[PDB]
Design an enzyme around this catalytic site. Sequence first.
Site, PDB file in Angstrom:
ATOM      1  N   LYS A   1     -41.424 -32.219 -31.486  1.00  0.00           N
ATOM      2  CA  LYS A   1     -42.043 -31.478 -30.378  1.00  0.00           C
ATOM      3  C   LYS A   1     -41.063 -31.374 -29.199  1.00  0.00           C
ATOM      4  O   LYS A   1     -41.085 -30.395 -28.468  1.00  0.00           O
ATOM      5  CB  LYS A   1     -43.336 -32.161 -29.918  1.00  0.00           C
ATOM      6  CG  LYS A   1     -44.516 -32.052 -30.876  1.00  0.00           C
ATOM      7  CD  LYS A   1     -44.753 -30.592 -31.328  1.00  0.00           C
ATOM      8  CE  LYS A   1     -46.156 -30.524 -31.939  1.00  0.00           C
ATOM      9  NZ  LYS A   1     -46.528 -29.125 -32.384  1.00  0.00           N
TER      10      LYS A   1
ATOM     11  N   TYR B   1     -47.092 -41.551 -33.517  1.00  0.00           N
ATOM     12  CA  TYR B   1     -46.732 -40.131 -33.454  1.00  0.00           C
ATOM     13  C   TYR B   1     -45.281 -39.956 -33.913  1.00  0.00           C
ATOM     14  O   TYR B   1     -44.915 -38.968 -34.563  1.00  0.00           O
ATOM     15  CB  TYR B   1     -46.938 -39.568 -32.040  1.00  0.00           C
ATOM     16  CG  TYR B   1     -47.008 -38.042 -32.006  1.00  0.00           C
ATOM     17  CD1 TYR B   1     -48.047 -37.362 -32.633  1.00  0.00           C
ATOM     18  CD2 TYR B   1     -46.037 -37.296 -31.330  1.00  0.00           C
ATOM     19  CE1 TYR B   1     -48.128 -35.985 -32.592  1.00  0.00           C
ATOM     20  CE2 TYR B   1     -46.086 -35.906 -31.315  1.00  0.00           C
ATOM     21  CZ  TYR B   1     -47.130 -35.270 -31.975  1.00  0.00           C
ATOM     22  OH  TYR B   1     -47.199 -33.906 -31.982  1.00  0.00           O
TER      23      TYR B   1
HETATM   24  N1  LIG Z   1     -54.950 -31.671 -32.976  1.00  0.00           N
HETATM   25  C1  LIG Z   1     -54.337 -32.162 -31.905  1.00  0.00           C
HETATM   26  O1  LIG Z   1     -54.707 -33.210 -31.351  1.00  0.00           O
HETATM   27  C2  LIG Z   1     -53.154 -31.458 -31.303  1.00  0.00           C
HETATM   28  C3  LIG Z   1     -52.440 -30.576 -32.026  1.00  0.00           C
HETATM   29  N2  LIG Z   1     -51.327 -29.938 -31.507  1.00  0.00           N
HETATM   30  C4  LIG Z   1     -50.520 -28.972 -32.299  1.00  0.00           C
HETATM   31  O2  LIG Z   1     -51.277 -27.792 -32.484  1.00  0.00           O
HETATM   32  C5  LIG Z   1     -50.875 -27.153 -33.723  1.00  0.00           C
HETATM   33  C6  LIG Z   1     -52.065 -26.935 -34.628  1.00  0.00           C
HETATM   34  O3  LIG Z   1     -52.598 -28.232 -34.942  1.00  0.00           O
HETATM   35  P1  LIG Z   1     -54.101 -28.368 -35.480  1.00  0.00           P
HETATM   36  O4  LIG Z   1     -54.846 -27.096 -35.320  1.00  0.00           O
HETATM   37  O5  LIG Z   1     -54.576 -29.630 -34.767  1.00  0.00           O
HETATM   38  O6  LIG Z   1     -54.191 -28.789 -37.011  1.00  0.00           O
HETATM   39  P2  LIG Z   1     -54.357 -27.751 -38.247  1.00  0.00           P
HETATM   40  O7  LIG Z   1     -54.101 -28.628 -39.417  1.00  0.00           O
HETATM   41  O8  LIG Z   1     -55.624 -26.901 -38.092  1.00  0.00           O
HETATM   42  O9  LIG Z   1     -53.233 -26.641 -38.044  1.00  0.00           O
HETATM   43  C7  LIG Z   1     -51.930 -26.932 -38.599  1.00  0.00           C
HETATM   44  C8  LIG Z   1     -51.595 -25.659 -39.331  1.00  0.00           C
HETATM   45  O10 LIG Z   1     -50.198 -25.607 -39.701  1.00  0.00           O
HETATM   46  C9  LIG Z   1     -50.138 -24.923 -40.938  1.00  0.00           C
HETATM   47  N3  LIG Z   1     -48.853 -25.171 -41.588  1.00  0.00           N
HETATM   48  C10 LIG Z   1     -48.367 -26.376 -42.016  1.00  0.00           C
HETATM   49  N4  LIG Z   1     -47.234 -26.293 -42.672  1.00  0.00           N
HETATM   50  C11 LIG Z   1     -46.957 -24.935 -42.682  1.00  0.00           C
HETATM   51  C12 LIG Z   1     -45.991 -24.179 -43.378  1.00  0.00           C
HETATM   52  N5  LIG Z   1     -44.993 -24.730 -44.084  1.00  0.00           N
HETATM   53  N6  LIG Z   1     -46.111 -22.828 -43.357  1.00  0.00           N
HETATM   54  C13 LIG Z   1     -47.127 -22.283 -42.681  1.00  0.00           C
HETATM   55  N7  LIG Z   1     -48.102 -22.895 -42.003  1.00  0.00           N
HETATM   56  C14 LIG Z   1     -47.955 -24.228 -42.029  1.00  0.00           C
HETATM   57  C15 LIG Z   1     -51.330 -25.474 -41.710  1.00  0.00           C
HETATM   58  O11 LIG Z   1     -51.628 -24.650 -42.833  1.00  0.00           O
HETATM   59  C16 LIG Z   1     -52.401 -25.427 -40.612  1.00  0.00           C
HETATM   60  O12 LIG Z   1     -52.963 -24.125 -40.510  1.00  0.00           O
HETATM   61  C17 LIG Z   1     -49.776 -28.039 -34.304  1.00  0.00           C
HETATM   62  O13 LIG Z   1     -48.516 -27.534 -33.874  1.00  0.00           O
HETATM   63  C18 LIG Z   1     -50.105 -29.404 -33.701  1.00  0.00           C
HETATM   64  O14 LIG Z   1     -48.989 -30.287 -33.679  1.00  0.00           O
HETATM   65  C19 LIG Z   1     -50.993 -30.096 -30.128  1.00  0.00           C
HETATM   66  C20 LIG Z   1     -51.661 -30.949 -29.377  1.00  0.00           C
HETATM   67  C21 LIG Z   1     -52.781 -31.779 -29.897  1.00  0.00           C
HETATM   68  C1  LIG Z   2     -50.590 -31.333 -38.350  1.00  0.00           C
HETATM   69  C2  LIG Z   2     -49.940 -32.642 -37.956  1.00  0.00           C
HETATM   70  C3  LIG Z   2     -49.274 -33.472 -38.965  1.00  0.00           C
HETATM   71  N1  LIG Z   2     -48.988 -33.021 -40.233  1.00  0.00           N
HETATM   72  C4  LIG Z   2     -48.861 -34.757 -38.599  1.00  0.00           C
HETATM   73  C5  LIG Z   2     -49.015 -35.214 -37.299  1.00  0.00           C
HETATM   74  C6  LIG Z   2     -49.600 -34.408 -36.337  1.00  0.00           C
HETATM   75  C7  LIG Z   2     -50.081 -33.140 -36.652  1.00  0.00           C
HETATM   76  C8  LIG Z   2     -50.849 -32.362 -35.609  1.00  0.00           C
HETATM   77  N2  LIG Z   2     -51.359 -33.231 -34.532  1.00  0.00           N
HETATM   78  C9  LIG Z   2     -52.566 -33.852 -34.723  1.00  0.00           C
HETATM   79  C10 LIG Z   2     -53.062 -34.748 -33.855  1.00  0.00           C
HETATM   80  C11 LIG Z   2     -52.291 -35.025 -32.689  1.00  0.00           C
HETATM   81  O1  LIG Z   2     -52.820 -36.025 -31.944  1.00  0.00           O
HETATM   82  C12 LIG Z   2     -52.114 -36.452 -30.750  1.00  0.00           C
HETATM   83  C13 LIG Z   2     -52.629 -37.866 -30.599  1.00  0.00           C
HETATM   84  C14 LIG Z   2     -51.822 -38.858 -31.406  1.00  0.00           C
HETATM   85  C15 LIG Z   2     -51.105 -39.901 -30.940  1.00  0.00           C
HETATM   86  C16 LIG Z   2     -50.524 -40.686 -31.974  1.00  0.00           C
HETATM   87  C17 LIG Z   2     -50.806 -40.211 -33.207  1.00  0.00           C
HETATM   88  S1  LIG Z   2     -51.774 -38.793 -33.129  1.00  0.00           S
HETATM   89  C18 LIG Z   2     -51.119 -34.380 -32.450  1.00  0.00           C
HETATM   90  C19 LIG Z   2     -50.583 -33.448 -33.392  1.00  0.00           C
HETATM   91  O2  LIG Z   2     -49.494 -32.877 -33.266  1.00  0.00           O
END
Ligand SMILES: NC(=O)C1=CN([C@@H]2O[C@H](COP(=O)(O)OP(=O)(O)OC[C@H]3O[C@@H](n4cnc5c(N)ncnc54)[C@H](O)[C@@H]3O)[C@@H](O)[C@H]2O)C=CC1
Ligand SMILES: Cc1c(N)cccc1Cn1ccc(OCCc2cccs2)cc1=O
EC number: 1.3.1.9
Lengths: 237, 237, 238, 238
Positions: free
Chosen positions: D162, D155
Site C-alpha cells: 500500500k 497487515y
Molecule cells: N476491507 C477493508 O477493511 C479495507 C480494504 N481496503 C482495500 O480496498 C480494496 C477492496 O477491498 P475489499 O472490497 O475489502 O475486499 P474484496 O475482496 O471485496 O475486493 C478485493 C477484490 O480484488 C479482486 N482481485 C484480487 N486479485 C485480483 C486479480 N489478480 N485480478 C483482478 N481482480 C483481483 C478480487 O476479485 C476482489 O473483487 C482493496 O484494495 C483493499 O486492500 C482499504 C481499506 C480497508
Molecule cells: C483483499 C486483501 C487480502 N488478500 C489480504 C489482506 C488484505 C486485503 C484487503 N484488506 C482487508 C482488510 C483490511 O483491514 C485493515 C485492518 C487490518 C489490520 C491488520 C490486519 S487487517 C485491509 C485490507 O487491505
Amino acid sequence: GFLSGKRILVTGVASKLSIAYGIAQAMHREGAELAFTYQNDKLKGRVEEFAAQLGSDIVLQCDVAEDASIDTMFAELGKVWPKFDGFVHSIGFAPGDQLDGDYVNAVTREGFKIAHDISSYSFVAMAKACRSMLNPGSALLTLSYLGAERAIPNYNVMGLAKASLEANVRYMANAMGPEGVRVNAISAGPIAVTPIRRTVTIEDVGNSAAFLCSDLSAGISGEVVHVDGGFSIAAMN
Amino acid sequence: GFLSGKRILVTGVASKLSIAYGIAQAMHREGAELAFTYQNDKLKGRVEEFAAQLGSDIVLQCDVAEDASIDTMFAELGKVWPKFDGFVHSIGFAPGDQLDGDYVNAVTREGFKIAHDISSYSFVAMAKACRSMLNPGSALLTLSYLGAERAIPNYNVMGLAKASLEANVRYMANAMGPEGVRVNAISAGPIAVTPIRRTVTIEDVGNSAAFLCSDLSAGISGEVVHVDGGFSIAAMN
Amino acid sequence: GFLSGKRILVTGVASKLSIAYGIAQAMHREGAELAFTYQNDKLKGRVEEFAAQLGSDIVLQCDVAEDASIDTMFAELGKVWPKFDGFVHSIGFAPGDQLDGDYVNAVTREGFKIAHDISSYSFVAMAKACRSMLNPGSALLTLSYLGAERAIPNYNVMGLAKASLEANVRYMANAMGPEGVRVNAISAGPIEAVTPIRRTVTIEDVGNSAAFLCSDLSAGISGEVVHVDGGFSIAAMN
Amino acid sequence: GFLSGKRILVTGVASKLSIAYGIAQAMHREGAELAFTYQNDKLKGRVEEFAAQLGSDIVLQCDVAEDASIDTMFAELGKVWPKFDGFVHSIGFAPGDQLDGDYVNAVTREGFKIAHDISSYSFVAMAKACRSMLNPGSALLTLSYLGAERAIPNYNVMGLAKASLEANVRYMANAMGPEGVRVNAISAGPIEAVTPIRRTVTIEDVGNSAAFLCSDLSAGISGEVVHVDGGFSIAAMN
Ligand SMILES: NC(=O)C1=CN([C@@H]2O[C@H](COP(=O)(O)OP(=O)(O)OC[C@H]3O[C@@H](n4cnc5c(N)ncnc54)[C@H](O)[C@@H]3O)[C@@H](O)[C@H]2O)C=CC1
Ligand SMILES: Cc1c(N)cccc1Cn1ccc(OCCc2cccs2)cc1=O
Ligand SMILES: NC(=O)C1=CN([C@@H]2O[C@H](COP(=O)(O)OP(=O)(O)OC[C@H]3O[C@@H](n4cnc5c(N)ncnc54)[C@H](O)[C@@H]3O)[C@@H](O)[C@H]2O)C=CC1
Ligand SMILES: NC(=O)C1=CN([C@@H]2O[C@H](COP(=O)(O)OP(=O)(O)OC[C@H]3O[C@@H](n4cnc5c(N)ncnc54)[C@H](O)[C@@H]3O)[C@@H](O)[C@H]2O)C=CC1
Ligand SMILES: NC(=O)C1=CN([C@@H]2O[C@H](COP(=O)(O)OP(=O)(O)OC[C@H]3O[C@@H](n4cnc5c(N)ncnc54)[C@H](O)[C@@H]3O)[C@@H](O)[C@H]2O)C=CC1
Ligand SMILES: Cc1c(N)cccc1Cn1ccc(OCCc2cccs2)cc1=O
Ligand SMILES: Cc1c(N)cccc1Cn1ccc(OCCc2cccs2)cc1=O
Ligand SMILES: Cc1c(N)cccc1Cn1ccc(OCCc2cccs2)cc1=O
C-alpha cells in the site's frame, strides 16, 4: 569512539563515491569493526582494497536477488562473527529503461518487480537471514530518497520502491524491537533552495549513519531521518 | 568527544528530571563547554549547583516572556562568550486549567496565547536576540511532542503550541541556513505498543540532542526527529 | 442539491474574489441556506448585498478578536436559527510587517500573537460559542495553506499560525466527534508550470470541495487537511 | 446527480460487502454510467447480476496479473465506450501466509512480489492500457489503508504494497495531470471507541467520498490520499 565494541556489516560499496564508502569511513573512525559484502566478481577487488584500508579482512560475496546467496553469506560471516550488531543496507537498483521520461509510459511490470525486489525486499531478506545472529542493542539502517514521498521527474518506479522500503523500515522496527533491534532509514539528499545552501556529502550521510547504528541513537527506531540539508521542508525558495 | 570545541547554552534546567538536565550531561560528556539560564529566583540555586558540577560558572537569568529579559541575558553572555555555537530550547508551559478534559471546553484565548507565546514564540525570540553571536556551523535545538501531529487527550492547547513550534523549526532553518546555522527539533516520547518495548529516558534524548547540536549532524536541518522508541510509527499493537 | 436541508454560517466574505465567496456560491448552488458575518462596519454594505443574491438576509457583525463579539453574534443568529449545521471559517490575518523578507528578522512577539489569535484561536473560539446550537451531522471547515507544512519565503509567521490551525482541526475533531460533529480543513493552492493539473486552483474548485466537506457526502471524513492545490504539494523539482 | 454525463469502470466488485459495491452504488445513484470487471469465471455470474441492478450490461473479465488480460479487457470495453472518464481500482491481494503473525518471519520474496504486483503495480498497468481512451476531466481512484503509513500487526507485507500504491498515486498524478487526468486514493478505515466519529466507516461513506473524487466537484484535488476513516489516524491514546 562512539562505535567501539560494535561489529557492523556494510553492503553496497562499489566505488569511492558510494554512500556506503562514506558510511564505512565514518564508522571506522568511530571505532567499529567492519565487514563488507560485494555484489559480484567485478566489484570484489575494489571492496577488498577498501576493507584492507579500514583494517578488515571480512569481504564476502552477496547478490541480494538470491535467497541462497544471502544465506551462504551469513553462514560465512558466522564463522568469524557468530553474533554482530547490525548492518548498513546501501543497495538500490532499477533498470535504466525505467528512468526515462513520463512515468506511466516508462514503467513495466518487470521493471517494477526488479526495482521493488532489489531496493525494498532485500532489506528484510537480509534481516530474516541473520535475525538470530543480532545482539541486543543491534541497529539496521537503509538509505532512501525524497522520491518516496513526492513525485520526482524521471525517478519514476524507484519512487515506489523507496516508499515500499520506508514502510519496510516501520514493519521491521515494530517486529524486531522486542528482541532489542532498531531499524531506521536515512533519506539522503542527492549526492540553492536547500536551507544549508550546499548539497550533502557522503561524509554528512556517513556521520548520521554512524550515529544511527550506535548506542547514541538508542531512542530512535522505525524513523526516516532526512539528511538533505533541509531541502524537503522548504518550498518556493 | 564529538562536541569538543563547541560552546552551547542550555535553557530549561529545573530539576534532575528535566530533559535539559539529560541534554546537559550528554553534551558535557562529549566535551562541550556549557552555559545555563534559569527562569526565576526559585530555580537559581539548583541551576548553579548543576552548572558547577559540569564545570561551568555561566548561569544567567532569563524569562522568555520578556524581550528585555532575553536581551539582557544575551548581553551578559556576550561578556564571556562573544560568539558561541547555538542553544538548547527546553522551555514549555501551558496553564494547568488548559489540560483538564475536553479540549474545546478547556481552551481559552488567554491559555492559547500563553501556551503559544512561551512554548513556540520564545524559540525564535531567542534566535533573534543572539543571531549575530552565532558561529558558522551553529545548531539550535528545541523539544516537541507527538501532540503536535495527533490529537492526544488532555494535551489540548499544548498540541497547537507544539505544532506552531515545529513550523518555527522549519521557518528558522530556512531563514538562518545561509549564515551557517541549523535548526532542528526532537519529538521526544513521554519521559508496550512502543517498538523498543520501554519508554525513552532523558539519557536517550540527551544523546540525540548532543548529536543534533554537533558537527556530526551537519546534513540535518529543519527536521523533527522522533526520539520516542518508534511509538508514533506503530498502530493497533 | 446535496446540501438541501442544511443551514451553514459563512465568515470571511470580503469581496467577489474571496475564497469564502466561492464557497458560499457552491453551497447555495447545492441548496444550503446561508448566513453571513462581516468583520466591521466598512464591510457591512457589501456583505449585505452578497448575502442577498445567495438567498440570505442573515448578516451579522463579528470581530473574532473579541469573545463578546463572537457571543453577541451567535445570540443574534440564534433568534433566526436556534439550531444549525456548521460554519465555514475563512478568516486569517497577520500584520503586513510580518511578511516582509527574512522571517527571523521580521517576526515580533506581537505579530506572532495576533497571527495566531486571529488565524488559529478564532476557529475554536467560534466552535465554543455555538457548540450547543449544532445539530448531529454538523460539519465545521477552515482554510489552510502549504506554509503550515513547508518554509515558504515571506509567508513567515502566518505558516506557524496555519500549523497551529491544522492541529486545532485535529483536536476539535477529536473533542466534538462523539456528539456528531466533524471538523476539517482545506489546504488551498494560492488563488503552476509545476502543478500537476498545470493551472492554479480557483475559488470555484475550493468552493466545490468545501461544499462536499460540509455535506453528509463526507460523513467518513474528520480531522483531515485536504489539499485542494492541484497536486502541487506532492510534486518536487517538476 | 453530480456524475451525470460520466462513464466510469469499476473493478473489484466481489459481493454486496465489497468496497467496490458501495462505490458503484453511490456513483450510480449520482447518475454515472458504469461498466464492471471480474477476476475469474467463478465471479462472472454474480458480477453480471450486480451490474444489471446498477444499470449496466458491460461486464468484462480482467485478471490484473496478466498484461494481455488487461489489454483484452480494454479492447472489449472500447467496442462500447471508445472514450470514458476514469476507473475505480479496488483490487488488493497478498497470500494468506503473509498475514500470519510476526512480519519478518512471515514475509517471503514471492509473497512480497505478488502483494506488490497485484495491489500496486496493477493500478498503473490499467492506466497505461487505457490512457488514450480517457477524456479530459477524467479521474482515477484506488483504495489504500493506514498500514501504508504505520506498522500494523498482521497487515505485514500488505502495508509495504500500500505504501508503494500511494507513491503510485503521486507519480501517476504528476505524469497524467497535464493531459487532464486526476489520480487519487482513499485510505479507508476497516470495513472505534477511539475513532473520533465513534463508529466504523461503511461502504456507503467510502462510496460517497469516492463518487466525489471521480466527479468534477473535486477538480482541484490530485495526487492526494484522502483518509475516510472517521479521523482514526489523527488521534492517539484516545
Ligand atoms: N476491507 C477493508 O477493511 C479495507 C480494504 N481496503 C482495500 O480496498 C480494496 C477492496 O477491498 P475489499 O472490497 O475489502 O475486499 P474484496 O475482496 O471485496 O475486493 C478485493 C477484490 O480484488 C479482486 N482481485 C484480487 N486479485 C485480483 C486479480 N489478480 N485480478 C483482478 N481482480 C483481483 C478480487 O476479485 C476482489 O473483487 C482493496 O484494495 C483493499 O486492500 C482499504 C481499506 C480497508
Ligand atoms: C483483499 C486483501 C487480502 N488478500 C489480504 C489482506 C488484505 C486485503 C484487503 N484488506 C482487508 C482488510 C483490511 O483491514 C485493515 C485492518 C487490518 C489490520 C491488520 C490486519 S487487517 C485491509 C485490507 O487491505
Ligand atoms: N546517490 C544518490 O544521490 C542517493 C542515493 N540513495 C540510495 O543510496 C544507496 C546507495 O546508492 P549509491 O552509493 O549512490 O550508488 P552505488 O551504485 O555506489 O551503490 C549501489 C550499490 O547497490 C549494489 N547492488 C545492486 N544490486 C545488488 C544486488 N542484486 N545484490 C547486491 N548488491 C546490489 C551495487 O553493487 C552497488 O554497490 C541506494 O539504495 C540509493 O538508492 C539515496 C539517496 C540519494
Ligand atoms: N516531559 C515530557 O514527557 C516531554 C516533554 N517535552 C518538552 O520538553 C521540554 C522540557 O520539558 P521538561 O524537562 O519535561 O519539564 P521541566 O518542567 O523540567 O522544564 C520546563 C522548563 O521550562 C522553563 N520555563 C517555563 N516558562 C519559562 C519562561 N517564561 N522563561 C524561561 N523558562 C521557562 C521552566 O523553568 C522549566 O525549566 C518542554 O518544552 C516540554 O514540552 C517533550 C516531550 C515529552
Ligand atoms: N488567497 C490565498 O491564496 C489563500 C488563502 N487561504 C486562507 O483562506 C482564508 C480566506 O483568505 P482570502 O479569501 O484569500 O482573503 P480575504 O481577505 O477575502 O478573506 C480574509 C477575511 O478574513 C476576515 N477577517 C480578518 N480579520 C478578522 C477579524 N478580526 N474578525 C473577523 N474577520 C476577520 C476579513 O474581513 C476577510 O473577510 C484565510 O484563512 C487565508 O489564509 C488559504 C490558502 C490560499
Ligand atoms: C542505483 C540507482 C539506480 N539503479 C536507479 C535509480 C537510482 C539509483 C540510486 N540513486 C541515484 C541517484 C539518486 O538521485 C536523486 C535525485 C534524482 C531525481 C531524479 C532522478 S535522480 C537517487 C538514487 O536512489
Ligand atoms: C511543561 C508542560 C506544561 N506546563 C503543560 C503541559 C505539558 C508540559 C510539558 N510536557 C509534559 C509532559 C508531556 O507528556 C506527554 C504525554 C501527555 C499526553 C497527554 C498529556 S501529557 C509532554 C510535555 O510537553
Ligand atoms: C489575509 C492574509 C493576511 N492578512 C496576510 C497573509 C496571508 C493572508 C491570506 N493569504 C493570502 C495569500 C496566500 O498566498 C499563499 C502564497 C504565498 C506564499 C508566500 C507569501 S503568500 C496565503 C494566505 O494565507
